[PDB]
Structure 1
Amino acid sequence: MIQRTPKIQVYSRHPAENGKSNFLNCYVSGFHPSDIEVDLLKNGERIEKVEHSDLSFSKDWSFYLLYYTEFTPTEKDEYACRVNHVTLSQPKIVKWDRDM
């Protein structure tokens, strides 16, 4: 048995342009076992219409999933991905930074 904590990236499908629809992505990978909870947050609040890819995995057997939702970035709105996994004592939040 192994435990591998997820790597997390949160980013947009296209370069963000305030006022323009886009997709907010949270890519979780490198994790084992496969149960994981991923929410995309808008100003600290769970975004309801979030979908995710079908569980798959990498050559080293670690899992990856993409969670995503349509969104329209603005100058003021903050977005984040919140991830929980057996390896995490508390949910981990990674803020969306449009420059990364």
Structure 2
Amino acid sequence: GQAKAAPKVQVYSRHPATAGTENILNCYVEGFHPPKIDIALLKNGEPMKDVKYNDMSFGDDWTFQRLVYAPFTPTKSDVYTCRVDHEAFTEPQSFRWEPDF
């Protein structure tokens, strides 16, 4: 029958973060079938500017991968999450960036 697979998500910045220094926030969603998905980047729960979406691709087990990214400047209290909605999820799921200052 239909082989469905739930996403696996990693949230990370392009460079090691320093409070107040511009960076790029990355969310990498992989391992999911079917290809239909929604991926959002969130700043304190709200969508972000200048979010870009790389090419959806797939690997050997047929499951799909997609990179999402945006410019941001991390601070000490700003919470950045990646929200993934996929039909293999019971409900849309959130993954918080860990600043790692």
What TM-score results when the alignment is normalised by the length of structure 1? 0.94
Who is 1:20 aligned against?
21
Q: Which runs of 5 or more structure 1 residues have no equivalent in the other structure? A: none
Q: CA deviation at 1:11?
A: 0.8
Who is 1:32 aligned against?
33
State how 1:52-71 maps to structure 2 within 5 Å.
Answer: 52-71=53-72
Distance 1:63 1:53 in 2: 12
Letter paired with 1:55: M
Letter paired with 2:52: E
Q: CA deviation at 1:49?
A: 2.1
Q: Which runs of 5 or more structure 2 residues have no equivalent in the other structure? A: none
Q: CA deviation at 1:62?
A: 0.8
Distance 2:59 2:78 in 1: 34
- Taking every aligned residue pair, what percent have the same amino acid on both sides? 51
Aligned residues: 99
What TM-score results when the alignment is normalised by the length of structure 2? 0.93
- Root-mean-square deviation (CA), in Å? 0.9
Q: CA deviation at 1:6?
A: 0.1
Who is 1:96 aligned against?
97
